[PDB]
Amino acid sequence: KVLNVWAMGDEAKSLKELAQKFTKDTGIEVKVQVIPWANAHDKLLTAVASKSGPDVVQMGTTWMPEFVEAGALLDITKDVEKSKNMNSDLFFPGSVKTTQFDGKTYGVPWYAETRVLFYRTDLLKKVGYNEAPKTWDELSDAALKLSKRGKDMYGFAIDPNEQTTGFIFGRQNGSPLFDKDGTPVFNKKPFVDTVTYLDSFIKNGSAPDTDLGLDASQSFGGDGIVPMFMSGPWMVNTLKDTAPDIDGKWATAVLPKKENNESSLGGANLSIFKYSNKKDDALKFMDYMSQPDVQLSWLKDTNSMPARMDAWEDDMLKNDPYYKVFGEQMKTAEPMPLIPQFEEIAQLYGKSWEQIYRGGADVQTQMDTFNDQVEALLKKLEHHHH
């Protein structure tokens, strides 16, 4: 009788609260189970293997490729086209891409995350920039200048464990990452030149090449040791809460442009488990969560940005100087390639990046080795294919 909803994390307090309001509204009873992130993969596969699980599941966008192939997620194409609040035109195009496979829809975008430039407005002004850097040459130039402030002063952070960063810059320089035949092209000139460009901030001392052990407040606040970096919407909240000393001294901006300035697109979708016996009630719970005002309540309780475009007509987003920039970036942002072993490929990239920035490898030779590893990884599907 009760609609089982799987949410991911340590806590699902805010969703329980919206689920209790949904129940008061619809007479639909909802039980939210909290699945720790390090158990969700195997928990969901177990549900598939046992043809028994929740009715609605929170799906990280990068997990969609594997759970669609695994048969975990119901084809809801027909149901969402005739819905009020779940139609694909109502969501950011990149969020929509994460739901669509062989022309079919396996979920509804719920909340979206994209990566923007965080910068110290006073520090950029100091080195001659009235606005955020707008191009790769400016990001390079502004960062080298900021690094000459002092001994352990920097200009820009390249996070060596951030999976998106390499590929976001690659696409900006016109790498498609995989060609039309699915062949990896990490060793071709648009991607190789991108990695040379990222490597230049390390070699020139404008990006840290070790773990400085600074939290965001410590690195970005104060004198602004690392005065520019890239992050998601969660960092707005963190800076306001942990670095009040820099109030009115920082902003977000859209990423600097090369051929384009497009960012990554991630977050979560709501999907129906394939063997749900309550599809009707699942679709009703999902359509409530797709309503603009619920997306805005969710944003207030958890700072997750709406995937529903109409929510962005609210003043708390439209006219917020931090979040409006995430809204603009969202418009053209592109999910990381939606294949089941992307996270492995991100990881191989991480290692190659390390061999360059730390071990001084040649960029072209190292990208040749990386491209060969991706090819090998793709041939034998050791993980995540079904």
State the binding site for Mg(2+): 147, 150, 153
Residue 205 makes contact with Zn ion by CB under 5 A: no
| Residue 22: partners with Cβ closer than 8 Å, 6 or more residues away | 28, 30, 285, 288
The size of the chain, in residues, is 386
Is residue 236 within 8 A of residue 316, CB to CB? The reply is no
Q: Is 99 exposed, middle or buried (0-12, 13-18, 19+ CB in 10 A)?
A: buried
How many residues touch Zn ion under the rule CB under 5 A: the total is: 18
Find the largest Cα–Cα distance for the chain. Answer: 65
Q: What 3-state DSSP class applies to 116? A: strand
Contact letters for Zn ion, residues 224-253 (x by CB under 5 A): -------------x---x------------
Identify which range of 29-37, 150-158, 272-280, 313-321 contacts Zn ion by CB under 5 A.
313-321
Is residue 112 within 8 A of residue 307, CB to CB? The reply is yes
Q: Partners of 231 in the beta sheet?
A: 116
Shortest spacing between CB 148 and Zn ion, in angstroms: 16
Shortest spacing between CB 147 and Zn ion, in angstroms: 12
Residue 148 makes contact with Zn ion by CB under 5 A: no
For helices 189-203 and 363-379, angle between their N-to-C axes, nearest 10 degrees = 130
Distance of CA 383 to the CA centre of its chain: 22
d(CA 178, CA 374): 10
Shortest spacing between CB 114 and Zn ion, in angstroms: 13
- The residue at minimum Cβ distance from Zn ion is 174
d(CA 3, CA 159): 40
Residue 21 makes contact with Zn ion by CB under 5 A: no
Which CB atom, from 14 or from 87, has the smaller least distance to Zn ion?
14
Residue 358 makes contact with Zn ion by CB under 5 A: no
Residue 152 makes contact with Zn ion by CB under 5 A: no
Shortest spacing between CB 82 and Zn ion, in angstroms: 26
Residue 301 makes contact with Zn ion by CB under 5 A: yes
Residue 324 makes contact with Zn ion by CB under 5 A: no
Shortest spacing between CB 383 and Zn ion, in angstroms: 5
Residue 128: other Cβ atoms inside 10 A: 9
Identify which range of 84-92, 126-134, 167-175, 278-286 contacts Zn ion by CB under 5 A.
167-175
In the numeric block, the tokens 């590929």 are attached to 167
Is residue 95 within 8 A of residue 267, CB to CB? The reply is yes
Strand 108-113 vs strand 116-120: parallel, antiparallel, or unpaired? unpaired
Shortest spacing between CB 66 and Zn ion, in angstroms: 5
Residue 383 makes contact with Zn ion by CB under 5 A: yes
Identify which range of 27-35, 223-231, 269-277, 311-319 contacts Zn ion by CB under 5 A.
311-319
In the numeric block, the tokens 């991706």 are attached to 374
Residue 355 makes contact with Zn ion by CB under 5 A: no
Which of residues 75, 193, 209, 310 is near Zn ion by CB under 5 A? 209
Shortest spacing between CB 160 and Zn ion, in angstroms: 8
Is residue 269 within 8 A of residue 289, CB to CB? The reply is no
d(CA 264, CA 334): 5
Residue 97 makes contact with Zn ion by CB under 5 A: no
Residue 384 makes contact with Zn ion by CB under 5 A: yes
Which CB atom, from 130 or from 247, has the smaller least distance to Zn ion?
247
Give residues in contact with Zn ion (CB under 5 A).
11, 13-14, 17, 174, 209, 237, 241, 301, 313, 332, 362, 364, 382-386
